[PDB]
């Protein structure tokens, strides 16, 4: 009957749909590889989808996926076993090298622009008409690392203008240079800003930005990467 | 075996239990100590379930059903064929679930991300525990739990419901449903919003978030924002399930009568209780 | 403890954003509204502006007419007494015409006519608002996802109070406007058709509802888990994969064996939610037109 028809029909629809859904999520990081980077033998039942090309705003060109994949940065890792499936140990300083939970991707060295073509993110000093409207203004508060030692002082807030959002705290270190600190990895308190991931001694290692009034996708990744990695790698210095 | 960008992430560490012992992968999958735990609990449980199936004398999945002990057994142990098997199976499920959560924690650490996912999952686990542990205890027999079978479980739902009248009147049930509906609404929108920006009209450039933000202000005069809608989603979801637990944990424990009748409180407020006319006067 | 990013710990404000202009008729957009710092702790604090236009007004006017046409009926039931009105608010009900009138538009007002008026108002209200979702997108050059997603919802509503009442031969088969009454109608609709738990569309529909919660839980917690690497900035992540997208995909690959991309995850999303009322609509449509009792149907399968 009709009902039987409809339901049998639907289970068929649903199956080609999953198939669709699945092949679309195969647009990045495919095809699969062996730990040595050579193409892996068994890529699953699903074919790579036919490529699609994105036209990036503000004349930044195009992106076609799937496409040639490459890390475009050295990886300082060495195998710890003779068969597949085991960890790869950092061969240096994982933090300094950017592997592990400290990994960063070779994104572009161009900042994200808003709908109009201006830099999406800005130090608040250069963002005409922006003020802390609620909560504790961090600016001026010392910054404490997981080792409970003071590392610097907030000397500005880098805001996201289109979303009127605090993205990073800029921090002034003992030598007078500054670093960005992701907003998402610090606790703003009444008399201090506490950073659990980094011990005071690692703030200097936080990668620097080439221009003082801009951050690029590449530098966001290298920073967030680094600060995140502290959680696993600063661990010996963290006390509470 | 690895995604084109996976290797630099596959470093040692992050394990909660047992150091480097189980710190490794099997194909795409991460094992970890709890990798093993869940496997063991999952193996055992499925076994017991098959064992129930022979005692039942059917291999047909639409028929197979593992029932809790009958009320006469209260919160004591029961013979295998008479409810023990379900009790173990329930222990094993719990073991599986919790372990699966703790593995999520272990992966979280290795990758250096937040614990929001293990977190949210614990709500699912807590809803399940409400229906097979917290409610039966409080009620006083494993027998109030739902049976493990594809349709028999739908039956428990239907019977348990109709016991208190039309269950629609359970007030926390009303609230729990509003989230389920609301969440789906919001998942519908979020998905649609991002896709429409990433896949504009033919030949146009990728829209920007500002476009997205704009699209909604134009539509319903307000845009909650990208950190927003994601905070929203997590919340509606967790809330739906939170109220779902609540509506059950109260049902049969502190309220055992017809749910519709509980509304008489409102209608019988002394200031309008006796005023004639309307529906109730 | 570590910061979780469920609530902002510092609010910042700037000049009211009047938004992108592209092809939008700017004469129609309103003025910026105030800013809720309340809202600001969760998401954006800026209210408005909003776009009026012709369809917005028609929609918005029919919308109120519907609501009010029901409202006067409730008062007429309450004996115009504000006390009764409050006491009995969820008990009042605007019911469709009796089965006697069939698909007739001639039912007396106290006997079903008023229901038709209200519905007519809702019909126009809803469709105009649909056209509104479409146009608003067109004017920004965006995909029409939202309008199509919306159409799914519309499907179930169309079926409940219009398509099914018409295929059954009478308006009496439609849903009454009322809080407790539409609950009862639902509960009763299942009883009559032999328990909707045997309607496999109903069962499918529940799977996608349950799933929507499962997914929006998964997606939300994930994006929050990696917002420490600017995860929420999904459009740029699509355009240039960040570590965020990577950690996201990998956490999931390592847990359950496969994974999404940032554009990908949102396709999972729109389809999981859209299938709820899509399947739903179908389950209800066959109910009572082709299948009288899902249990009997369940025994044979035809
Ligand atoms: C009876 C039911 C009737 C009830 C009415 C309710 C209908 C509600 C449907 C809502 C659909 C939501 C979809 C969301 C979406 O993608 O929208 C954007 C999508 C693109 O938007 P755009 O702005 O035009 O383009 C922007 C970009 O250029 C392009 O942007 P893009 O890349 O994002 O869009 C590309 C998109 C294009 O999307 C579509 O083309 C949409 C397809 C609509 C399908 C409708 C489902 C009907 C359910 C049938 C169930 C059977 C039961 C009987 O790709 C897909 O999503 C492909 C879908 C894959 C389907 C798999 C089919 C398998 C067939 C079986 C094969 C055998 C299997 C082997 C075994 O919109 C549409 O294409 C419109 C579809 C409208 C049709 C409505 C039906 C009319 C009646
Ligand atoms: C929480 C609310 C009620 C209840 C009310 C209902 C109602 C009402 C319905 C279901 C439906 C289903 N229920 Mg139930 N269900 C409950 C508790 C459970 C439990 C549990 C351990 O707590 C589980 C595992 C299930 C599982 C299921 C599926 C068989 C089915 C589709 C659900 C779905 O899409 O979810 C979304 C999740 C996903 C898409 C992720 C993938 C889920 C897959 C499908 C899981 C299948 C597991 C199953 C085959 C058993 C495996 C166990 C062993 C390892 C073999 N229910 C409680 C008692 N359930 C629907 C149905 O059609 O089944 C008859 C239906 O109509
Ligand atoms: C006793 C009750 C019966 C039963 C009878 C029914 C009936 C009858 C129906 C459902 C339906 C549904 N049931 Mg059932 N159901 C039962 C038990 C259950 C259980 C359970 C036991 O755990 C669950 C989980 C469900 C779950 C569900 C949903 C999956 C499904 C509706 C999805 C939806 O989101 O629509 C919500 C979305 C809409 C209604 C879309 C409307 C969109 C419109 C356009 C909104 C306009 C707004 C308006 C103009 C006002 C404006 C707003 C103001 C400005 C604020 N049922 C039992 C067996 N169920 C529906 C279905 O699809 O079944 C197959 C349905 O018709
Ligand atoms: C795919 C399935 C899900 C879905 C999707 C969906 N719904 C949608 C969309 C989509 C994709 C839209 O684009 C569209 C939308 O614009 O949302 C922002 C819509 C929408 N879904 C809505 C509601 C809705 N969707 C629902 C369900 C669902 N929608 C599904 C679960 C439900 C239920 C019953 O679960 C409801 C109630 C609307 C918010 C919106 C469609 C708006 C519309 O058509 O308006 C027409 C008429 C008016 C303008 C009426 C206004 C009259 C009011 C002023 C009266 C009430 C006054 C009241 C006392 C006010 C106070 C409220 C307080 C909280 C402050
Ligand atoms: C809290 C909000 C919602 C939510 C969230 C949620 N679910 C989650 C997560 C999150 C955040 C995960 O991270 C985790 C996941 O990895 O998803 C891919 C998970 C998950 N949610 C799942 C299912 C699921 N979630 C559901 C619900 C929900 N999940 C909510 C609505 C439902 C239902 C019925 O609504 C189901 C069916 C899994 C796909 C996955 C967890 C997988 C897992 O725990 O693996 C460990 C266990 C096994 C491999 C099998 C164990 C076998 C048992 C020992 C025996 C079988 C016993 C069982 C009781 C029989 C039941 C029979 C039925 C017919 C009744
Ligand atoms: C790219 O991104 C995006 C954006 O940004 C640019 C966006 O803007 C948007 C747009 C999104 C929105 C405008 C938000 C839309 C969300 C909603 C429709 C509203 C949210 C709804 C709720 C918070 C409420 C839901 C709950 C309901 C209906 C029940 C009400 C009840 C209670 C709060 C609890 C009551 C309880 C008590 C007192 C306890 C009693 C105790 C016992 C009974 C016991 C999207 C989609 C998006 O994608
Ligand atoms: C933006 O970012 C995001 C991503 O990517 C960038 C993502 O991918 C995802 C994840 C989401 C998707 C890929 C979309 C599709 C997902 C769903 C519809 C959810 C439903 C899921 C399932 C049905 C799969 C359930 C599968 C499970 C639990 C695992 C299957 C497992 C097995 C067969 C074996 C289980 C493992 C065992 C026994 C232990 C380990 C193994 C040993 C041998 C030991 C999200 C949410 C996301 O937000
Ligand atoms: C404060 O008092 C005043 C008077 C000021 C008020 O305004 C108060 C008002 C309230 C008390 C209002 C309360 C309103 C509610 C309780 C409403 C509840 C509504 C629901 C629960 C609706 C549920 C389901 C509705 C459904 C499925 C409607 C479907 C409608 C349609 C598909 C429309 C079909 C079209 C029809 C039959 C006519 C078509 C005619 C043509 C010519 C095309
Ligand atoms: C996480 C534990 C879940 C267990 C589910 C039910 C187990 C019942 C345990 C009772 C065993 C014996 N008793 C009555 C003497 O306590
Ligand atoms: C978006 C893809 C995920 C879809 C989930 C498919 C599994 C649902 C199984 C429901 C069982 C249903 N049925 C028809 C017997 O009632
Ligand atoms: C519904 C769950 C689907 C998970 C898919 C997992 C893909 C695994 C690919 C094969 C890897 C094989 N193995 C375990 C033999 O090494
Ligand atoms: C109901 C949800 C079911 C999810 C559908 C299962 C998809 C499995 C995809 C496995 C992909 C294998 N691969 C390529 C990663 O090895
Ligand atoms: Fe998202």
From Swiss-Prot, chain A:
Location(s) in or outside the cell: Cellular chromatophore membrane
Listed Pfam families: PRC, PRCH
Job of this protein: The reaction center is a membrane-bound complex that mediates the initial photochemical event in the electron transfer process of photosynthesis.
GO molecular function, one term: electron transporter, transferring electrons within the cyclic electron transport pathway of photosynthesis activity
Subunit organization: Heterotrimer composed of subunits L, M, and H.
Cytoplasmic topological domain residue ranges: 22-240
Family from the record: Belongs to the reaction center PuhA family.
CDD domains cross-referenced by the UniProt entry: PRCH (cd00226)
Swiss-Prot/TrEMBL keywords: Bacteriochlorophyll, Chlorophyll, Chromophore, Electron transport, Membrane, Photosynthesis, Reaction center, Transmembrane, Transmembrane helix, Transport
Membrane topology: Single-pass membrane protein
Recorded GO CC terms: plasma membrane light-harvesting complex; plasma membrane-derived chromatophore membrane
Cofactor annotation comment: Binds 4 bacteriochlorophylls per trimer. Binds 2 bacteriopheophytins per trimer.
Alphabetized InterPro entries for the sequence: Bac_photo_RC_H_C, Photo_RC_H, Photo_RC_H_N, Photo_RC_H_N_sf, PRC-brl_dom, PRC_barrel-like_sf
Transmembrane segments: 2-21
GO annotation, biological process: photosynthesis, light reaction
Main location: membrane
Protein name in UniProt: Reaction center protein H chain
Transmembrane helix among keywords: yes
Tree of life domain: Bacteria
Cofactor: a bacteriochlorophyll; a bacteriopheophytin; Fe cation; Mg(2+)
Curated annotation (Swiss-Prot), chain B:
Annotated GO MF terms: bacteriochlorophyll binding; electron transporter, transferring electrons within the cyclic electron transport pathway of photosynthesis activity; metal ion binding
Membrane topology label: Multi-pass membrane protein
Binding of Fe cation, residues: 190, 230
CDD domains: Photo-RC_L
Binding site for (7R,8Z)-bacteriochlorophyll b: 153, 173
GO biological process, one term: photosynthetic electron transport in photosystem II
Periplasmic side: 56-82, 139-170, 251-281
Annotated a ubiquinone binding sites: 216
Pfam families documented for this protein: Photo_RC
Keywords annotated in UniProt: Bacteriochlorophyll, Chlorophyll, Chromophore, Electron transport, Iron, Magnesium, Membrane, Metal-binding, Photosynthesis, Reaction center, Transmembrane, Transmembrane helix, Transport
GO cellular component terms given for this protein: plasma membrane light-harvesting complex; plasma membrane-derived chromatophore membrane
Membrane-traversing stretches: 32-55, 83-111, 116-138, 171-198, 225-250
Domain of life from the UniProt record: Bacteria
Subcellular compartments: Cellular chromatophore membrane
Membrane side Cytoplasmic: residue ranges: 1-31, 112-115, 199-224
Physiological role: The reaction center is a membrane-bound complex that mediates the initial photochemical event in the electron transfer process of photosynthesis.
Family membership noted in the UniProt record: Belongs to the reaction center PufL/M/PsbA/D family.
Assembly and binders: Reaction center is composed of four bacteriochlorophylls, two bacteriopheophytins, two ubiquinones, one iron, and three highly hydrophobic polypeptide chains (designated L, M, and H).
Protein name in UniProt: Reaction center protein L chain
This protein's encoding gene: pufL
From Swiss-Prot, chain C:
Name of protein: Reaction center protein M chain
Reported function: The reaction center is a membrane-bound complex that mediates the initial photochemical event in the electron transfer process of photosynthesis.
SUPFAM superfamilies for the chain: Bacterial photosystem II reaction centre, L and M subunits
Family note: Belongs to the reaction center PufL/M/PsbA/D family.
UniProt subcellular location: Cellular chromatophore membrane
Membrane topology, record value: Multi-pass membrane protein
Binding sites annotated in the UniProt record for Fe cation: 219, 234, 266
Binding-site residues for (7R,8Z)-bacteriochlorophyll b, renumbered to this chain: 182, 202
């Amino acid at each position: 009957d009709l009902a039987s028809l409809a339901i049998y029909s639907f289970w068929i629809f649903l199956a080609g749909l999953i198939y669709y859904l699945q092949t679309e999520n195969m647009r990045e990081g495919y095809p699969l590889e062996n730990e040595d980077g050579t193409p892996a033998a068994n890529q699953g039942p699903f074919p790579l989808p036919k490529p699609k090309t994105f036209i990036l705003p503000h004349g930044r060109g195009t992106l076609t996926v799937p496409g040639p994949e490459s890390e475009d940065r050295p990886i300082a890792l060495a195998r710890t076993a003779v068969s597949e499936g085991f960890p790869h140990a950092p061969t240096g300083d994982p933090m300094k090298d950017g592997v592990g939970p400290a990994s960063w991707v070779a994104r572009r060295d161009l900042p994200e622009l808003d709908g109009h073509g201006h830099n999406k993110i800005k130090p608040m000093k250069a963002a005409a008409g922006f003020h802390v409207s609620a909560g504790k203004n961090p600016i001026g508060l010392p910054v404490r690392g997981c080792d409970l030692e003071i590392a610097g002082k907030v000397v500005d807030i880098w805001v996201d203008i289109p979303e009127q959002m605090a993205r990073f705290l800029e921090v002034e270190l003992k030598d007078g240079s500054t670093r960005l600190l992701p907003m998402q990895m610090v606790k703003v308190q009444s008399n201090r800003v506490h950073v659990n991931a980094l011990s005071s001694d690692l703030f200097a290692g936080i990668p620097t930005i080439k221009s003082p009034t801009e951050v690029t996708l590449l530098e966001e990744d290298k920073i967030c990467g680094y600060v995140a990695g502290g959680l696993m790698y600063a661990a010996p210095k963290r006390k509470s | 075996a690895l995604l084109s960008f996976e290797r630099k992430y596959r470093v040692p560490g992050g394990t909660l239990v047992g150091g480097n012992l189980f710190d490794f992968w099997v194909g795409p999958f991460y094992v970890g100590f709890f990798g093993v735990a869940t496997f063991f609990f999952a193996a055992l449980g499925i076994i017991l379930i098959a064992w129930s199936a022979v005692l039942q004398g059917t291999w047909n999945p639409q028929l197979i059903s593992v029932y809790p002990p009958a009320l006469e057994y209260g919160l004591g142990g029961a013979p295998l064929a008479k409810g023990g098997l379900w009790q173990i199976i329930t222990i094993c499920a719990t073991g599986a679930f919790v372990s699966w959560a703790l593995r999520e924690v272990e992966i979280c650490r290795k990758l250096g991300i937040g614990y929001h996912i293990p977190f949210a999952f614990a709500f699912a686990i807590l809803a399940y525990l409400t229906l097979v542990l917290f409610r039966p205890v409080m009620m006083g027999a494993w027998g109030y739990a739902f049976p493990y079978g594809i349709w028999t479980h739908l039956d428990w739902v239907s019977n348990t419901g109709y016991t208190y009248g039309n269950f629609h009147y359970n007030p926390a049930h009303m609230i729990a449903i509003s989230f389920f509906f609301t969440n789906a609404l919001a998942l519908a929108l979020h998905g649609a919003l991002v896709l429409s920006a990433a896949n504009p009209e033919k030949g146009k450039e990728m829209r920007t978030p500002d476009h997205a933000a704009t699209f909604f202000r134009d539509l319903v005069g307000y845009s909650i924002g990208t950190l927003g809608i994601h905070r929203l989603g997590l919340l509606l979801s967790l809330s739906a399930v939170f109220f779902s637990a609540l509506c059950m944990i109260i049902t049969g424990t502190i309220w055992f009568d017809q749910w519709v009748d509980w509304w008489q409180w409102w209608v019988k407020l002394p200031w309008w209780a006796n005023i004639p006319g309307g529906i109730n006067g | 403890a570590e910061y979780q990013n469920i609530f902002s710990q510092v609010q910042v404000r700037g000049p009211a954003d009047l938004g992108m202009t592209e092809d939008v008729n700017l004469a129609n957009r309103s003025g910026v509204g105030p800013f809720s710092t309340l809202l600001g702790w969760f998401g954006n604090a800026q209210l408005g502006p909003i776009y009026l236009g012709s369809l917005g007004v028609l929609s918005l006017f029919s919308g109120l007419m519907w609501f009010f046409t029901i409202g006067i009926w409730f008062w007429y039931q309450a004996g115009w007494n504000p006390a009764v009105f409050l006491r009995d608010l969820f008990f009042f009900s605007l019911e469709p015409p009796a089965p006697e009138y069939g698909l007739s538009f001639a039912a007396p007002l106290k006997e079903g006519g008023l229901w038709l008026i209200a519905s007519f108002f809702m019909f126009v209200a809803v469709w105009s608002w649909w056209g509104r979702t479409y146009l608003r997108a067109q004017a920004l050059g965006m995909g029409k996802h939202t309008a199509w997603a919306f159409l799914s919802a519309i499907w179930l509503w169309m079926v409940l109070g219009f398509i099914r009442p018409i295929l059954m031969g009478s308006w009496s088969e439609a849903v009454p406007y009322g809080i407790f009454s539409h609950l009862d109608w639902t509960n009763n609709f299942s009883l009559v058709h032999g328990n909707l738990f045997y309607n496999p569309f109903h069962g499918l529909s529940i799977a996608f509802l349950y799933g929507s919660a499962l997914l929006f839980a998964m997606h939300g917690a994930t994006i929050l888990a990696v917002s420490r690497f600017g995860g929420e900035r999904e459009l740029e992540q699509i355009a240039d994969r960040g570590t965020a997208a990577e950690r996201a995909a990998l956490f999931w690959r390592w847990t359950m064996g496969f994974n999404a991309t940032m554009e990908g995850i949102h396709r999972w999303a729109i389809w999981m939610a859209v299938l709820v009322t899509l399947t739903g609509g179908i389950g209800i449509l066959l109910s009572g037109t082709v299948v009288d009792n899902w249990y009997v149907w369940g025994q044979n399968h035809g």
